[PDB]
Design a protein around this ligand. Structure first.
Ligand SMILES: [Mg+2]
Ligand SMILES: [Mg+2]
Ligand SMILES: [Mg+2]
Ligand SMILES: [Mg+2]
Ligand SMILES: [Mg+2]
Ligand SMILES: [Mg+2]
Ligand SMILES: [Mg+2]
Ligand SMILES: [Mg+2]
Ligand SMILES: [Mg+2]
Ligand SMILES: [Mg+2]
Ligand SMILES: [Mg+2]
Ligand SMILES: [Mg+2]
Ligand SMILES: [Mg+2]
Ligand SMILES: [Mg+2]
Ligand SMILES: [Mg+2]
Ligand SMILES: [Mg+2]
Ligand SMILES: [Mg+2]
Ligand SMILES: [Mg+2]
Lengths: 70, 117, 66, 151
RNA sequence: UUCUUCUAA
RNA sequence: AAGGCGGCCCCCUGGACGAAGACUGACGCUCAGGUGCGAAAGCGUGGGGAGCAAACAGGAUUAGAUACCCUGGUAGUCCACGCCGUAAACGAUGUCGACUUGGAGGUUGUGCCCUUGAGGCGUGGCUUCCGGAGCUAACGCGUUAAGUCGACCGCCUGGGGA
């Protein structure tokens, strides 16, 4: 996130630009992931539960798209 | 005191404390202040307000070196990740660069075990 | 919308930096296949080519190291 | 309450001055429903208060009222292992209500004989910016910036 | 932040 | 094959699959005993030792705290060569073969259409999810069966004691 302040730019623009690239490059969640040791059991289980979360919610959103509520 | 015009602001924003260090472009440090050194303790010193007065102390200590331009390297995750450079602008410094310099290994040394809290 | 499936190359060249600079980010990380839409056969070839161009100092490992 | 924001009741103005605020002050002074005595104490203490200052009774009351109005109070939140005193901004109605309570509460604690002597001396000191009522104003403000890290 | 246990038909 | 395998490069090397043919001619399947492989922890000898970390020490916490939390920290983790032969070694589902409605994918070949674009039509391998008949105590399984059958093996017989 090496960000140079452009010429005639307000500081609140560049700070908001700096928050954007750090969320883009994934810095805060990377260090928080490496703060403690995660077992290869815990890493394989959390990644598998993340896939079922991305899949059954896709099926729940499409099933709720069909039928009405009132 | 030798006057210097441009400078580098290192910010070591951890979870427990924020360390602000004004240095030159060579790494020879000019002055520093920490959030724990700003009259705060424990839960109070791990706050984004603690860092933005830590930047005010640190900018006051390099007043005599005559700094007008300053670029900022930011290291670590913390509450003073953002609130430091707001007050560091508020000292009257024309900002130049905001670089993110957190150390990221490519799965190097093993981190400690998880806190069973 | 994979580009390599359209142009049809048998193997991505690591020496073609200007192609490979369209697949790394500003901080030098390899852009995922979700974003560029690269078919996963060429994604393995592309990652194997970026890792070779990093070794020959044709691409940086990150934007920070110096 | 949980459910609704309420509609507050309307207060009469005082008979002497027509001020809504001074009649809010006589209610805070009033104990046991005896408004007639509390009407007499306020009108006796504010009589000698304007005597010491030469201004209007309504004008000189606000001067002592100005120096006891808090600007930021704190409140307990306690989301962690201990109590967090978060400094919350106080709305201008409660600013006026906390001030009149502190003047009355300080006027109970003085050692003068008459209550109107206890309250006129406290108002004359509050316009002079001393007394227990402005000391209560300080401890609220002192606890405010001692907890300004919480927001 | 810590925060245990309760027999008889 | 299972355990397992993750920068990049070279050397040696096993298996799978596909497309067309060519060829051998039942040469097959399973398997007691047997033999081989087999995570981590551990053991032996010799190295290595950054980080992490049992043990242990100190600090806290608490009624106590031989714990969780903290600050340290030794075997160990790493390498070579041996040994151990165990795990919730799990899909808690032995291997092999045949048949039985479908849908949405992933991955990896291959044929065809003018590739008139990343498309259109097929045809193989592997894999994920949902689900019909059927099955099942139910949960569910459901062409990768726990459906319908065949071959062979391993195993079960109330809970403790074990
Ligand atoms: Mg720690
Ligand atoms: Mg007991
Ligand atoms: Mg023949
Ligand atoms: Mg066999
Ligand atoms: Mg071992
Ligand atoms: Mg031993
Ligand atoms: Mg050993
Ligand atoms: Mg040894
Ligand atoms: Mg050591
Ligand atoms: Mg420890
Ligand atoms: Mg066993
Ligand atoms: Mg396993
Ligand atoms: Mg599994
Ligand atoms: Mg078993
Ligand atoms: Mg099903
Ligand atoms: Mg049956
Ligand atoms: Mg069967
Ligand atoms: Mg059954």
């Amino acid at each position: 996130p090496v960000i140079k302040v452009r010429e005639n730019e307000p500081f609140d623009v560049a700070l908001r630009r700096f928050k954007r690239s750090c969320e883009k490059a994934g810095v805060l969640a990377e260090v928080r992931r490496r703060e403690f040791y995660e077992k290869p059991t815990t890493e394989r289980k959390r990644a598998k539960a993340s896939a079922v979360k991305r899949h059954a919610k896709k099926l729940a959103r499409e099933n709720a798209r069909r039928t009405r509520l009132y | 005191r030798k006057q210097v015009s441009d400078g580098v602001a290192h910010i070591h924003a951890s979870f427990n404390n924020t360390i602000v260090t004004i240095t030159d472009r060579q790494g020879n440090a000019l002055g520093w202040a920490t959030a724990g050194g700003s009259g705060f303790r424990g839960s109070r010193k791990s706050t984004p307000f603690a860092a933005q007065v830590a930047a005010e102390r640190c900018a006051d200590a390099v007043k005599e070196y005559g700094i007008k331009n300053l670029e900022v390297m930011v290291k670590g995750p913390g509450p003073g990740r953002e609130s430091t450079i707001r007050a560091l602008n508020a000292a009257g410094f024309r900002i130049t660069n905001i670089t993110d310099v957190t150390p990221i290994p490519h799965n190097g040394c093993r981190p400690p075990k998880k806190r069973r809290v | 919308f994979c580009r390599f499936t359209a142009e049809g190359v048998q193997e991505i060249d690591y020496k073609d930096i200007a192609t490979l600079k369209n697949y790394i980010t500003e901080s030098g990380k390899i852009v995922p296949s979700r974003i560029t839409g690269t078919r996963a056969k060429y994604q393995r070839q592309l990652a194997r080519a970026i890792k070779r161009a990093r070794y020959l100092s044709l691409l940086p490992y990150t934007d920070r190291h110096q | 309450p949980r459910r609704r924001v309420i509609g507050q009741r309307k207060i009469l103005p005082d008979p002497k001055f027509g001020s809504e605020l001074l009649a809010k002050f006589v209610n805070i002074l009033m104990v046991d429903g005896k408004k007639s005595t509390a009407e007499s104490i306020v009108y006796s203490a504010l009589e000698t208060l304007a005597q010491r200052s030469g201004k209007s009774e309504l004008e000189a009351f606000e001067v002592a009222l100005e120096n006891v109005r808090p600007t930021v109070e704190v409140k307990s939140r306690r989301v962690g292992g201990s109590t967090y005193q978060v400094p919350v901004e106080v709305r201008p109605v409660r600013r006026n209500a906390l001030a009149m309570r502190w003047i009355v509460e300080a006027a109970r604690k003085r050692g003068d004989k008459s209550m109107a002597l206890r309250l006129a001396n406290e108002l004359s000191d509050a316009a002079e910016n001393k007394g227990t009522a402005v000391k209560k104003r300080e401890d609220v403000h002192r606890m405010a910036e001692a907890n300004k890290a919480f927001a």
